[PDB]
Amino acid sequence: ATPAYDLQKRDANNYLLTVSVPGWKEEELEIETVGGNLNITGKHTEETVEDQTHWIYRGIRKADFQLSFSLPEHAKVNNAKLEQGLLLVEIYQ
Amino acid sequence: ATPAYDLQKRDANNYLLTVSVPGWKEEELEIETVGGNLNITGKHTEETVEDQTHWIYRGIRKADFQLSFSLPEHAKVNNAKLEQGLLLVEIYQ
């Protein structure tokens, strides 16, 4: 199960990547540009003991992921903002 | 497609409802207690013209929903906090 995402083109030299990451903290998320690819990695935290009695129902699943997007030469990631359970990454030519 | 949720029991007189609502704004969300049921309604905003050329890929779907939970008599909703794409509702006996 990989996060849903959207990819938009704001114009020909710009892209906006939106990744659905509800419940993810900034420290669990990493973005890096390596060998011309943009890698977005979610590594969900060191486990926690969970009393299964306290859990009545668990419909929300959170699993580590890695998304990879080839960047056109010579594209740069300008910012990555985490807001409202969404990771927004602007990619500029 | 209804939002995923979790339901936890913090102890016997307390519950925590967590609803996955990434990208939802506070103005699109409503919680109300009516006839002993807790109703959580998401009504996604007045449409916007969307240039389908700007959309390369749209994996993130956002659809209006309504979740309903019977409250034990005499339970109250203490707060509803929207944070990190999650709606957290504490329900107290």
Residue numbers in the entry:
A (entry chain A), B (entry chain A): 40 to 132
What is the paper's account of this structure, in its own sentences?
Small Heat Shock Proteins (sHSPs) are ATP-independent chaperones which prevent irreversible protein aggregation by binding to misfolded substrate proteins. Most sHSPs exist as large oligomers which undergo drastic rearrangement or dissociation into dimers upon activation during stress, in order to execute their chaperone function. Aggregation Suppressing Protein A (AgsA), an sHSP from the pathogenic bacterium Salmonella enterica has been reported to form dynamic oligomers.
The core ACD fragment of AgsA:His-DD crystallized as a symmetric dimer in the space group P41212. Mass spectrometry of the crystals revealed that the full length protein (size 17.1 kDa, 150 amino acids) had degraded in the crystallization condition to a fragment with mass 12.7 kDa, which corresponds to residues 35–147. Continuous electron density could be traced for residues 40–132, and the monomer adopts an α-crystallin-like fold, with residues 83–103 forming a long loop which separates two β-sheets. In the AgsA:His-DD dimer, this groove is occupied by the dimerization loop of a subunit belonging to a neighbouring dimer. This interaction buries 434 Å2 of surface area and involves five hydrogen bonds and one salt bridge.
